Amino acid sequence: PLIVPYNLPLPGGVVPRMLITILGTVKPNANRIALDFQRGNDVAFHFNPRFNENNRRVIVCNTKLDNNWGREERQSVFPFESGKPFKIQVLVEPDHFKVAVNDAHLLQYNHRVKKLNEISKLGISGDIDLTSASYTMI
Numbered sequence: 001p002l003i004v005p006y007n008l009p010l011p012g013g014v015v016p017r018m019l020i021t022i023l024g025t026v027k028p029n030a031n032r033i034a035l036d037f038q039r040g041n042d043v044a045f046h047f048n049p050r051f052n053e054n055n056r057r058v059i060v061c062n063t064k065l066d067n068n069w070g071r072e073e074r075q076s077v078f079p080f081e082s083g084k085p086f087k088i089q090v091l092v093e094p095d096h097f098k099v100a101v102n103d104a105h106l107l108q109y110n111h112r113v114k115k116l117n118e119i120s121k122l123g124i125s126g127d128i129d130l131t132s133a134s135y136t137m138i
């Protein structure tokens with residue numbers, strides 16, 4: 001297993017057709033998970049499954065600029081299950097990040113941070129056993 005929280009370097013930032021694959025297992029009583037695609041201290045793309053927000057499950061996505069969170073984008077389609085092995089794939093496209101979980105399309109997030117070449121770290125945190133974190137070009 002990998003340490004959680006985990007830092008995955010993205011050397012020279014991200015580019016279209018870069019596919020980031022995160023494999024792990026959701027903890028049995030999971031409350032939260034977060035991916036943070038970072039440009040220095042800024043978070044270009046925060047992907048945040050919440051397992052118990054007002055007694056429902058929701059995906060929250062956002063951007064953090066100068067330590068300020070922006071407007072949230074929310075998705076009630078919630079593919080994660082407590083205790084189960086998962087795969088998150090984030091595909092970088094010219095105008096958005098595309099996320100698929102367990103080989104099913106989940107959501108798209110339009111680029112707010114435009115310096116893709118400076119998004120040089122992925123943070124992985126929360127209620128998971130993390131097995132691997134890697135990237136390839138499709």
Ligand SMILES: CO[C@@H]1[C@@H](n2cc(-c3cc(F)c(F)c(F)c3)nn2)[C@@H](O)[C@@H](CO)O[C@@H]1Cc1cn(C2CCN(C(=O)NC(C)(C)C)CC2)nn1
Pocket residue numbers: 032033034046048060061062069070071072073074125126127
């Ligand atoms: C609790 O802090 C989370 C952030 N967070 C979570 C984590 C974390 C760490 C881990 F270690 C980990 F393992 C994990 F799973 C998650 N770290 N930070 C972050 O998720 C943020 C994502 O907006 O929401 C809140 C903070 C926040 C949110 N907001 C505003 C943003 C604009 N909003 C909005 O537009 N609302 C409408 C859509 C209804 C119009 C209202 C709410 N202001 N501050």
